[PDB]
Design a protein around this nucleic acid. Structure first.
Ligand SMILES: [Mg+2]
Ligand SMILES: [Mg+2]
Ligand SMILES: [Mg+2]
Ligand SMILES: [Mg+2]
Ligand SMILES: [Mg+2]
Ligand SMILES: [Mg+2]
Ligand SMILES: [Mg+2]
Ligand SMILES: [Mg+2]
Ligand SMILES: [Mg+2]
Ligand SMILES: [Mg+2]
Ligand SMILES: [Mg+2]
Ligand SMILES: [Mg+2]
Ligand SMILES: [Mg+2]
Ligand SMILES: [Mg+2]
Ligand SMILES: [Zn+2]
Lengths: 38, 176, 5, 142, 209
RNA sequence: GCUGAAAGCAUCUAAGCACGAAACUUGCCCCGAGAUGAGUUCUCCCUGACCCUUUAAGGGUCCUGAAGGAACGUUGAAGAC
RNA sequence: GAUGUCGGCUCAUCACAUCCUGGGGCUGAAGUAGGUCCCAAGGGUAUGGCUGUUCGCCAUUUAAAGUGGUACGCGAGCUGG
RNA sequence: GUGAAGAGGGAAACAACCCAGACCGCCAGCUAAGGUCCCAAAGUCAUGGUUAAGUGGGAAACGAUGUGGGAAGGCCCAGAC
């Protein structure tokens, strides 16, 4: 997981989801995609 | 709120009781019970369970859908037992069932012993795979996760414990 | 005693 | 003529019992602080403790709005360097359910010898029963 | 589990056929007479009050002798308490001897340490001594700095300084029980224990386990 | 991570559950009721005459001197005192 | 009409932008060993040669020899190169 | 313009900001700024909305199916998404 201020869709399979008041990205195909806002 | 609109049928041989917010579903596979939140209103005025949001609650519509999904799975549970199949992959990976407790070998220096909850049952057709059967979809789902947690599937070779239908994205090891 | 330059 | 002033050796004091079950901590505290200071009495005097005795029951059942049931933090310093201690609302209820009321009320009462004396009339209990039946407190609803 | 009160008779050496020498502190544990039993319904905690030894009858105050008379016991050196877990019970006047430790591998020993009086920082806190030469002026073994100038402007609580050392309760944990001699009321424990010879001593089962 | 909607799917989360570190609260050790919110338990001691008016948690005389403590003396592996 | 400096010595205390130990996500992570990011301040966090030196270089160690604030902490505490 | 050479009330404390120029006395009243749950004088005041972050009670580029409102457009019971 790579943490950075800007979270975006890097590919089609990516999705943005809010879990605990923090925006993070979950990708089913490529775990490199997943990020957290911080 | 499409899920909430769809009613849930209670066929013959299934008994359902409503007492305020708590509901008790009974069937041939056992019994189940949970306490619904005050924001969801459930009625038993017909042969099908109907759901609606209680007035004054903003989350009622979204909350109503959860009750339909939860009760819909529960009625299935009492009629049929949810089944989870896990597969063991490895050179010397084996599983054994002593009853409420399962003994696994996963290359550890110590034995792995896991006890099941009262509402779950397990049995071993073969030492390379294990099957979990139960009435409640929640605990049975949790049991498999803990079973899978001991050795999550190995990326470069796939060895470990995995759901029977799981797909593992094998990755080739770095060359040179 | 002391100095400060 | 000179304005009337209350006499600490002639003031009349009566006992009350309050149930804290389901009451919001802050708004219950203000009423308790108002009563302990005697602001409701027509003979209120700033330099005389004219308040009444208050008994608080079910101190563990007080309610707090929002997410502060877990985000409310209580701070106190032991006096030693680095001796800063933390205690959330849940921890205080679990450990000492009675301190939540007194800490809230204590910060609402005046400061100084008179304020401490007024606090001494507050008697909080975690359970539903109290041993002060001899005082025959009246049921007071807030 | 319940312990016992003994006296530090001294220190001795125990030889073993294998050729190893075990330094053992000899502790004499006379009969321990229970003087009172503490109950939840009346006292709020479960414990037993015990006395050991004997003291001259001319110096037992009837407030103390009456306490002993209540339990039908002879006045001892002093009174000590031990907490009771769920499984143990005792009766007033019951006498407990050293065999209680016959099944105990490890024991806990507590007592008052030897009193060193007013001790300097070097002895009390292992402070490093400053230069004995090279120009040092009347500051060979003084504590030195004790603060950080204006910003704090004070000395923090708990600062290590010269003061009373020793003469305080100390507990030594996980002491092996070498031998129990119930025919002479003695307990042998490997290693040294706090206090001087003849001082009161409290022995309890090893809590550390 | 489980179940799972808002969003027919998906989703660790919004309702409801599980795991998770030398940090945190305990566990271990020491001080500790000046904790004036001054706590509890067990024993021990005292069961007389009167007198005055400002007649009240009043003052005073006689008798009495308990429990215990202190002081002094011999002293301590206790201690600057 | 006076707040005494660099460095050393002694004694420290706090911050976390963490050097070691602890828990994790990715890895162009086979393993061993690393890279990077996240959580974590509980403890621990070299002796010498040269130089007044801090620093630095060098020698040899260590799980590591952290970065800073505190009058570039500390001379009514020492030293005075 | 104010302080300097200006008190008083407000901004927690705070010469220069806001309100306002103290001849003396009063246990009278009405107001300014600013305020009315408690410390602490006055609304736990009456309506219609927004916020769930204790935002309010510090901070940007930038990021995000947070959530409320408004005006349009594409597809759509010839079956859309
Ligand atoms: Mg004030
Ligand atoms: Mg001594
Ligand atoms: Mg000199
Ligand atoms: Mg000298
Ligand atoms: Mg100060
Ligand atoms: Mg001067
Ligand atoms: Mg800890
Ligand atoms: Mg060096
Ligand atoms: Mg040389
Ligand atoms: Mg300096
Ligand atoms: Mg110097
Ligand atoms: Mg100085
Ligand atoms: Mg010189
Ligand atoms: Mg001038
Ligand atoms: Zn992606």
């Amino acid at each position: 997981m790579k943490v950075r201020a800007s979270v975006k869709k890097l590919c089609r399979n990516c999705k943005i989801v809010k879990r605990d008041g923090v925006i993070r990205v979950i990708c089913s195909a490529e775990p490199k995609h997943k990020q957290r806002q911080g | 709120s499409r899920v909430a609109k769809a009613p849930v049928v209670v066929p013959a041989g299934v008994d359902v009781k409503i007492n305020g917010q708590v509901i008790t579903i009974k069937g041939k596979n056992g019994e189940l019970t949970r306490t619904l939140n005050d924001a969801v209103e459930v009625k038993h005025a017909d042969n099908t369970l109907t759901f609606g949001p209680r007035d004054g609650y903003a989350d009622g519509w979204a909350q109503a859908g959860t009750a339909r999904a939860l009760l819909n799975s529960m009625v299935i549970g009492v009629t049929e037992g949810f089944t989870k199949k896990l597969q063991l992959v490895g050179v010397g990976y084996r599983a054994a069932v002593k009853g409420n407790v399962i003994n696994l070998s996963l290359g550890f220096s110590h034995p792995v012993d896991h006890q099941l909850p009262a509402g779950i049952t397990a049995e071993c057709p073969t030492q390379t795979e294990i099957v979990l059967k139960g009435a409640d979809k929640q605990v049975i789902g949790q049991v498999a996760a803990d079973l899978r947690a001991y050795r999550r599937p190995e990326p470069y070779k796939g060895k470990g414990v995995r759901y029977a239908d799981e797909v593992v994205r094998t990755k080739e090891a770095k060359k040179k | 005693m002391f100095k400060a330059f | 003529m000179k304005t009337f002033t209350a006499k600490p050796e002639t003031v009349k004091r009566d006992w009350y019992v309050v149930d804290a079950t389901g009451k919001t901590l802050g708004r219950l505290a203000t009423e308790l602080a108002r009563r302990l200071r005697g602001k409701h009495k027509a003979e209120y005097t700033p330099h005389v403790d004219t308040g009444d005795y208050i008994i608080v029951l079910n101190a563990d059942k007080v309610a707090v709005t929002g997410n502060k049931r877990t985000d409310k933090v209580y701070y106190h310093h032991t006096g030693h360097i680095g001796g800063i201690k933390q205690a959330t609302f849940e921890e205080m209820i679990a450990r000492r359910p009675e301190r939540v009321i007194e800490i809230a009320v204590k910060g609402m009462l005046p400061k100084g010898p008179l304020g401490r004396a007024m606090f001494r009339k507050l008697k909080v209990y975690a359970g539903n029963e109290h041993n002060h039946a001899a005082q025959q407190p009246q049921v007071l609803d807030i | 589990m319940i312990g016992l009160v003994g006296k530090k008779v001294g220190m001795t050496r125990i030889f073993t056929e294998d050729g190893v020498s075990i330094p053992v502190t000899v502790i004499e544990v006379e009969a321990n007479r229970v003087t009172q039993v503490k109950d939840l319904a009346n006292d709020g905690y479960r414990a037993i009050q015990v006395t050991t030894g004997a003291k001259k009858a001319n110096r037992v105050t009837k407030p103390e002798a009456g306490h002993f008379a209540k339990a039908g016991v002879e006045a001892g050196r002093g009174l000590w308490e031990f907490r009771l877990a769920e499984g143990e019970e005792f009766t007033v006047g019951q006498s407990i001897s050293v065999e209680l430790f016959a099944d105990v591998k490890k024991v806990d020993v507590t007592g008052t340490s030897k009193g060193k009086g007013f001790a300097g920082t070097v002895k009390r806190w292992n402070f490093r001594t400053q230069d004995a030469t090279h120009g040092n002026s009347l500051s060979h073994r003084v504590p030195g700095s004790i603060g950080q100038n204006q910003t704090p402007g004070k000395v923090f609580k708990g600062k290590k300084m010269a003061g009373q050392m020793g003469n305080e309760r100390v507990t030594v944990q996980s002491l092996d029980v070498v031998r129990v001699d119930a025919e002479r009321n003695l307990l042998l424990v490997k290693g040294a224990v706090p206090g001087a010879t003849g001082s009161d001593l409290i022995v309890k089962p090893a809590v550390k386990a």
